[PDB]
């Protein structure tokens, strides 16, 4: 399983962000709004292949979460689909980026703004977001935003769709890596 692949909780489906680790402990990052209120995660809709259990969740304000792998046999590739990821970096205005999600697959675009505030309503406000002109749709939450072999962010939300075009906001991955003391590989 790798970045962009589907992940299922008891409530719905999101996408895996990046596979990360600390020492010899493996986890995966995804969106905080996906980990919020979720305990167990499965690799399939049938819920027959377990992945692991939620170890941390930060949403709203931020939008990241981390899941500790409990499945010992499933391959945990340090890639996004076929793409190798070797490091993480900070987004910059004008940066060419690519997102992969379990619903829409792979789409590209550019970073159009930094430190954006997104109000999802009902007091669910997230800050410090990366704004882009990349589209995304339901099911793509938590998927990776990368640039070549560099990990950049996690899909949070936005407007529009892939047919008409849209605006998607991402949580900077550097912040999540620091919070949990993990790193990509």
């Amino acid at each position: 399983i790798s970045g962009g692949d589907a992940i299922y909780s008891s409530t719905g489906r999101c996408s895996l962000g990046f596979n990360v680790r600390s020492g010899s402990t493996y986890y995966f990052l995804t969106a905080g709004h996906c980990t919020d209120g979720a305990t167990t995660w499965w690799a399939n809709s049938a819920r027959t292949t377990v992945l692991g259990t939620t170890s941390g969740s930060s949403f709203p304000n931020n939008d990241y979460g981390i899941v500790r792998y409990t499945n010992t046999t499933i391959p945990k590739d340090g890639t996004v689909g076929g793409q190798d990821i070797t490091s993480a970096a900070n987004a910059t205005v004008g940066m060419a980026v690519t997102r992969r999600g379990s619903t829409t697959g792979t789409h590209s675009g550019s970073v159009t703004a930094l430190n954006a505030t997104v109000n999802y309503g009902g007091g669910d406000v997230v800050y410090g977001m990366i704004r882009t002109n990349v589209c995304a749709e339901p099911g793509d939450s938590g998927g990776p935003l990368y640039s070549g072999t560099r990990a950049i962010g996690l899909t949070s939300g936005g407007s529009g769709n892939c047919s008409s075009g849209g605006t998607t906001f991402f949580q900077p991955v550097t912040e999540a890596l620091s919070a949990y003391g993990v790193s990509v590989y």
Binding site: T11, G12, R13, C14, A31, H33, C34, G101, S102, T103, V118, N119, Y120, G121, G122, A136, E137, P138, G139, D140, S141, T155, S156, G157, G158, S159, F169
Partner: protein, 51 residues
């Protein structure tokens, strides 16, 4: 599902589908409610889950 607090300028992208009266599966409640608004209140909920 009530769409009173809509529209909303943005939605999170988790997948928990709803089936609209237009036979389109809406990916989540925020997505569905924004469409209802855009439809000037003509779109309604058929049932929960995919169409």
């Amino acid at each position: 599902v009530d769409c009173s607090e809509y529209p909303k300028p943005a939605c999170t992208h988790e997948y928990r589908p709803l089936c609209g009266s237009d036979n389109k599966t809406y990916g989540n409640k925020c997505n569905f409610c924004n469409a209802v608004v855009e439809s000037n209140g003509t779109l309604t909920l058929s049932h929960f889950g995919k169409c």
